[PDB]
Design a protein around this nucleic acid. Structure first.
Lengths: 119, 154, 73, 161, 121
RNA sequence: GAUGUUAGGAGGGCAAAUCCGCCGAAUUUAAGCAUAUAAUUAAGCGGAAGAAAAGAAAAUAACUAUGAUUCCUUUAGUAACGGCGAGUGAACAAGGACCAGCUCAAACGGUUAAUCCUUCGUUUGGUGCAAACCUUUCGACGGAAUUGUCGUUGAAUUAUUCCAUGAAUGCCUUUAAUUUGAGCAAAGUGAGCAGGAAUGCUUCCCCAUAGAGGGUGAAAGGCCCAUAGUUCUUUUUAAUUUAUUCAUUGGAAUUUUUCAUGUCGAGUCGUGUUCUUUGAGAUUGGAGCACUAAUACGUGUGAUACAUUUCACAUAAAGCUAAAUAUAUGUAGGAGACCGAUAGCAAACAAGUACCGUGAGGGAAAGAUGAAAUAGUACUCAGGAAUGAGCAAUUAAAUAGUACCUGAAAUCGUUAAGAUGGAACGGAUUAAGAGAGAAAACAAGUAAAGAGGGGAAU
RNA sequence: ACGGACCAAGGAGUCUAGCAAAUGUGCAAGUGUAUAUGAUUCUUUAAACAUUUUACGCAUAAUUAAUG
RNA sequence: UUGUGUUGAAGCGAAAUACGUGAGUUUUCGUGGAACAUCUCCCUAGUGCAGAUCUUGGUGGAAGUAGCAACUAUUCAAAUGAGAACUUUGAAGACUGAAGUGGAGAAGGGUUUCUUGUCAACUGUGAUUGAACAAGAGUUAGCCGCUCCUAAGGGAUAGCU
RNA sequence: AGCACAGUCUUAACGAUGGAUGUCUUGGUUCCUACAGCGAUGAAGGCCGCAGCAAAAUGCGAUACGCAAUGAAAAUUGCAGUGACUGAAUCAUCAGAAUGCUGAAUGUAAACUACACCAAUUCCCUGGGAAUAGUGGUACUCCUACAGAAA
């Protein structure tokens, strides 16, 4: 049983090697289960979860190092770029919605709404 | 109100003359218990009530403002006499006068302990006891409708 | 006040006060003002004499604000 | 029909249950509207949320004698108050380009109402102790001391009614 | 009572009680503290842990006391070492006691309990 | 125009309660029925939003006049439409909610497209642990565009007064509100009775800004969660705090002095005719076809078709726009004089499930042991076994044994009593039997002795 | 003549609009405060409370196709 | 408003020297094991059943009755088993009579196939049998088919409505 | 040890059948309030899978009744088994990672796990070293820019 923080410092090589040997041990456990042997059947869950953990760490490392590759560059692949709602993606930018012509810009600047009181 | 189409959400058919059965509508099909059973109709099981309750019942009422003011004035006057307050149900046999008034510092006390002490010292110990011991779980289906207890008015 | 309704006091009387011979059918004379001039004519003539026909000219759009005038004696 | 009754007239020959609606939420809506306008006047920082409207004579012979709040002052009365429409709409003055002053009485009375509102105005500087003389007929900005002493005073809403 | 965001419906909150998750069940499985222990930690109630000495003061076993042996949040019960009972078959099993019927007399030391007791300050 | 697996993008489907277009009945009413009504509805097709649509007068009025749209009260079941039958049925004014105005076209700018986009670079500072995000103006390139982007809303001229502008230095405090997530949160587990078990009953104490609810072996303010209250934390948003020196760059409003009365939406309006729609009637809107305008002194409304003509009001044939408004949908909250398992949704449950139909579709029944099965029946006997029985056994209780709360009637069994010649039951009156019964169906008081309970008297 | 083998449970003049009569109640040539607003009311409260000395309905006057 | 409940509420069965004229009301015993009433006055309604070839559910007499009738036909002995007319074995008598209850396939079915157990229900009599129930297992392709071709024809593209 | 005729009907007591009644209620119903689009970045819907023993429902997607992270934080259990003396057992939150075949379904098809064409593709170390028949792309319409052909 391996936790997710200590293997966070491994390189991809031994991460994949750990995954491979762990899968091999899981395969051996399944072979034993298929045979008459049943003592080890309860370690299948733990080994399966270890496989899930190491896969999670490896995939997160790969995704982060891929994002570092498309840092800025304005043309990230679709999965790398934002995944908002489709209509949110197609919405006009706040700048575009707030854009105004020079005529109304100078009108607003010269005669803004004013704060005041009464007697 | 009941759900608008309740009991009428089935296919209508009353093939019933010559079938030696009542002319009530029957649900169609087969292979299930419901097939051929009596469909909508107040007499039929699962058939919808006779006059489904509607939300546009006259819930509220309009009361003349003059009549409401008359009623409030009369209620104050009635509270002003001893016999009526006694007959209403309150235990005021130890009150000095029925239209009892207390100094404005009653508006300033802030502890229920001293409020109860003041109420007792006025002679309403019996009234307080009645209110306290009257707490009781009510009868009927009301108590499963967030209406558990029933208290008297002090 | 559904407990004051007259139907409650005919609760075990079979016909519900609507007659044993004539029964309570649904619209046995027609719907609404159906039979005027034909079989409700006596009712119409006895209680609403000048009902049928038309007299006078048409005021196309009235605008009662024009002719509104209250009177004090 | 039978007996001596008015002839029936009920216009319920269509599917009316679809169109029936009952206002269970009249007072709830009242409370919500009051809360919304209270929050508005709390947010705009002491400036009243009402806008000044002229008083006008109701049309037709039926309501000849009665006056009521109209929509917006006209160009003539704004000019008589010395106030361009563009600048007036930024200090809570309603303006409409459709009304015309057909009578000197209406002109003078709306002008004097405008002047009363104007002199009751106390302007808040646009830039936090950068008081200036105003533009387009807007009064000059008040100073820090008078703003301080007037903000705690009850704002009169009589001129709005 | 005075805030309308929280329901007072019997149906609603008894459904909440009977379908509460385990984490919430831990909180509603609390119980009183003895007088001296209450004065020592200046708090009134505490959720029960596995190894606390407890004293049951309600029910058929209202007199004796013992150390809790296990807690069943699914059944809303706790078990104490010497309150066993004989089944019909012939083996012993602990008697389920609702935590509301017991008072804590001594509670075990754990890093979390002192952090929450200091939080109680 | 083609064509391009050239580069970058978009549409498609689901979902509908509210919303926007089209298409479009009949049942029904008229006591028949054909116009009419149902209904500009249902069904059908298409299209959006958190609202939609409408909306800034080719409006109303006729007055002392109003001033975009929407919605509420009302006008008003009114004017009007209609085998003038059945039926149908607005608008203006008035009182309110809300309140917001704008831009293209056309005009003017040619000592100069002053515009726009793509791609590639540069920095101006900032909140993030990170991921990412907000600001930033200097470009260069390639294009689009004069078959028209951008600026002005006539153009200059004085006077004031405003608005954006950069650099340097300092200042970033307080409070109220609003809104998340967290904590803290009073007082009995005191006698006694009866209990399997108090939260019950008596009795003695209390807390309450908490006596809402839920749980706990029976009805709990003081056993637990929570509740009243309060303290932190999150969102934004008001008032408050401080701004000071130097500079030129452009713009705006009004006010002086002159020009020129400019522009103003065409197969469109309009008219005829046909169909539909409307309350709209010698035609309310729309549509098809035919004809087909004027140029602001015009042309369009002013609810009866015309001709001549006054008057008033608007300025069509281009466009955007928040609020007040609606929500039988979805999700999440909160409630109720609602239903309480043949009820309430079809579905309290493994319910749109089982099952039926080739298919479109149709569509159920079914909740409850006990406080605790961490008490689900051990042991013995008899039986092949199912089961049964017990001197045996859990429980307070098993006639609470899993179909398990209670356990009606129909129907059936056991025992007892009675009746019994082709009905049975019954009404009225008694008699004989058999069950039950003392509250009127007798005996207050009196004296003694035994057990008790009270009240008054110091 | 038709329905009824038996038992249990369910089972049918109601709701809304509009008019009138009757009766009770309030006020009375007036009556109803509509929509809406305010207000230390906001568990209850979606109810209660209130309305700066020409809103609207009905009534206070009828009659006529109608100018009136 | 003012009451009843673990010293037993509601409900239910039988009743009562009970009251009423009557719908009913009130009590007793038994059962029941957790709530119930308010007739002090009033408010409210999905408020009162003998019927509707009423609806749903349950249950009767008919009645141990009609009936368990096509396919010529069974018998002896043994085994298993608690139990054998209809399970198995041997013997006999017969049938189907290659237009076959014989072998292969298609459509349709979908594990009914096999082995080992097994009998609560089903197998309209029995049943130890079984297509039932339970646990496991079983389907091997370059050559058999699909896959390819085109037919009656279907869908779609371009247009055009 | 003996005695009742049988049947039919009536009554009572006790039981069978049945599931009414009463009492329950994590359900419904109605109203009020608040927010409100999902999809070629592959939706809704449908299949197929996934647990040690695992059918349904619920949950999930080859990391498959759950991974990571964050808050709480000692249990979780039918057995087996796993957990500290708190990134560990279990809840809650859920932003990271992952998300089978389909489906508007979009390479051609479809009662096919059938058939294309173009890049071979993917991974490990800091240019090498491996492993893979595996992986991506290719619909129709349209917009902007571009390309070389046309009159």
């Amino acid at each position: 049983n391996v936790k997710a923080y200590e293997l966070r410092t491994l390189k991809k090589k031994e991460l994949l090697d750990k995954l491979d040997e762990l899968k091999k041990e899981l395969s051996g456990l399944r072979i034993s289960k298929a045979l008459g042997n049943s003592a080890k059947n309860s370690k299948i869950h733990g080994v399966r979860k270890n496989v899930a953990r190491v896969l999670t760490v490896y995939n997160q490392k790969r995704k982060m190092e891929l994002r570092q590759l498309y840092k800025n560059k304005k043309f990230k692949p679709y999965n790398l770029r934002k995944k908002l709602t489709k209509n949110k993606r197609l919405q006009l930018s706040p700048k575009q919605k707030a854009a105004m012509t020079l005529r109304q810009k100078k009108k607003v600047q010269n005669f803004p709404q004013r704060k005041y009181l009464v007697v | 109100a009941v759900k608008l189409g309740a009991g009428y959400e089935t296919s209508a058919e009353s093939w019933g003359t010559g079938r030696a059965v009542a002319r009530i509508p029957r649900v169609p099909g087969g292979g299930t218990h419901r097939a051929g059973q009596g469909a909508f109709g107040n007499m039929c099981r699962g058939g919808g009530m006779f006059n489904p309750t509607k939300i546009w019942r006259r819930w509220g009422r309009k009361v003349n403002l003059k009549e409401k003011r008359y009623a409030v004035c009369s209620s104050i006057a009635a509270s002003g006499v001893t016999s009526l307050v006694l007959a209403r149900g309150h235990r005021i046999s130890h009150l000095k006068e029925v239209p009892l008034v207390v100094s404005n510092d009653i508006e300033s006390l802030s502890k229920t302990k001293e409020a109860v002490n003041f109420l007792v010292s006025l002679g309403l110990k019996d009234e307080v006891n009645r209110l306290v011991k009257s707490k009781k779980i009510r009868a009927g289906k009301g108590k499963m409708r967030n209406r558990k207890y029933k208290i008297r008015n002090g | 006040a559904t407990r004051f309704k007259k139907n409650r006091k005919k609760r075990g009387h079979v016909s519900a006060g609507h007659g044993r011979v004539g029964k309570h059918r649904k619209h046995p004379g027609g719907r609404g003002k159906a039979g005027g001039l034909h079989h409700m004519r006596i009712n119409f003539d006895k209680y609403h004499p000048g009902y049928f026909g038309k007299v006078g000219m048409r005021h196309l759009n009235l605008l009662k604000n024009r002719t509104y005038c209250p009177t004090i004696n | 029909v039978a007996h001596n009754n008015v002839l029936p007239n009920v216009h319920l020959h269509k599917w009316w249950q679809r169109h029936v609606r009952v206002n269970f939420s009249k007072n709830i809506k009242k409370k919500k509207r009051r809360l919304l306008r209270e929050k508005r006047r709390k947010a705009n920082g002491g400036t009243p949320i009402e806008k000044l409207h002229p008083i006008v004579h109701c049309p037709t012979q039926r309501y000849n004698f009665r006056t009521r709040l109209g929509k917006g002052f006209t160009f003539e009365e704004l000019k008589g108050a010395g106030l361009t429409p563009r600048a007036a709409q930024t200090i809570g003055i309603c303006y409409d380009k459709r009304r015309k002053n057909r009578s000197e009485e209406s002109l003078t009375k709306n002008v004097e109402r405008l002047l009363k509102y104007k002199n009751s105005l106390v302007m808040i500087p646009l830039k936090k102790n950068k008081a200036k003389k105003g533009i387009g007929g807007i009064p000059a900005d008040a100073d820090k001391n008078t703003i301080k002493e007037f903000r705690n005073k009850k704002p009169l809403l009589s001129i709005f009614k | 009572k005075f805030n309308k965001q929280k329901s007072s419906s019997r149906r609603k909150m008894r459904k909440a009680h009977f379908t509460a998750p385990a984490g919430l069940r831990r909180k509603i499985m609390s119980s009183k503290l003895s007088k001296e222990l209450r004065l020592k930690y200046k708090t009134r109630s505490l959720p029960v842990r596995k190894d606390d000495e407890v004293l049951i003061c309600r029910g058929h076993n209202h007199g004796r006391e013992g150390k809790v042996v296990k807690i069943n949040r699914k059944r809303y019960k706790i078990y104490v070492e010497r309150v066993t009972r004989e089944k019909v078959n012939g083996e012993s099993t602990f008697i389920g006691i609702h935590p509301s019927n017991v008072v804590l007399t001594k509670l075990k030391v754990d890093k979390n309990r002192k952090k929450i007791l200091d939080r109680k300050a």
